Design a binder for this molecule. Sequence first.
Ligand SMILES: [Ca+2]
Ligand SMILES: [Ca+2]
Ligand SMILES: [Ca+2]
Ligand SMILES: [Ca+2]
Length: 242
Amino acid sequence: LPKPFFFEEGKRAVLLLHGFTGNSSDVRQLGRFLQKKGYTSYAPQYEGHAAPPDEILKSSPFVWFKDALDGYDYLVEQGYDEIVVAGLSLGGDFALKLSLNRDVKGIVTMCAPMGGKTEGAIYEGFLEYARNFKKYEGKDQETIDNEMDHFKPTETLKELSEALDTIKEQVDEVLDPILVIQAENDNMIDPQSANYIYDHVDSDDKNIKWYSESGHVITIDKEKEQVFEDIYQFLESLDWSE
Ligand SMILES: [Ca+2]
Ligand SMILES: [Ca+2]
Ligand SMILES: [Ca+2]
Ligand SMILES: [Ca+2]
């Protein structure tokens, strides 16, 4: 089961945030790519994640945001003033909100949703997350159905819906340079969310890129090297002190 990572190179640092029911391995290759370019990167994990799915149900999205803020403060503790935040799916929503609470050099959202519509796509996915996990646990097929009929996700998925709506009303306060990344054929979020973000931030420096062959977990799909390179292009265009 995955764990956070910290790759120390130069003085320019990137904070990487994963998605709902994801973990650090979703952003690890991107961490290795940035390291080879000389960027330091740090990837925390939210509470309940990289763990049995019941742990998520005992948690709250409002904890998960603090895990992101603690990520930023950790980088600063370790000696890094100048930090870009880059976030995947839900993590992309957190990156937007984090920029309103800490000094960042820039923002990168990757397939970040706009709107707390948790029905349909988000619902079945939490269910499948527990299916393949209860399978990973080595549970017979008769068992997997038993604790599944005892899985109540309505609580957790509803705090998630409020949290997202709050952040949607906040996009108009974002000011820092931004790169919006969105997969064209997304089955999980509404890909029009990327247009909502690009059009409504108050940034003076913004950019949107579309990928025509990837899925929602874009950092591990077939076009990922292209996505890494466009992120690098963005980072090099900011005003690092060094
Ligand atoms: Ca250290
Ligand atoms: Ca507002
Ligand atoms: Ca303006
Ligand atoms: Ca730009």
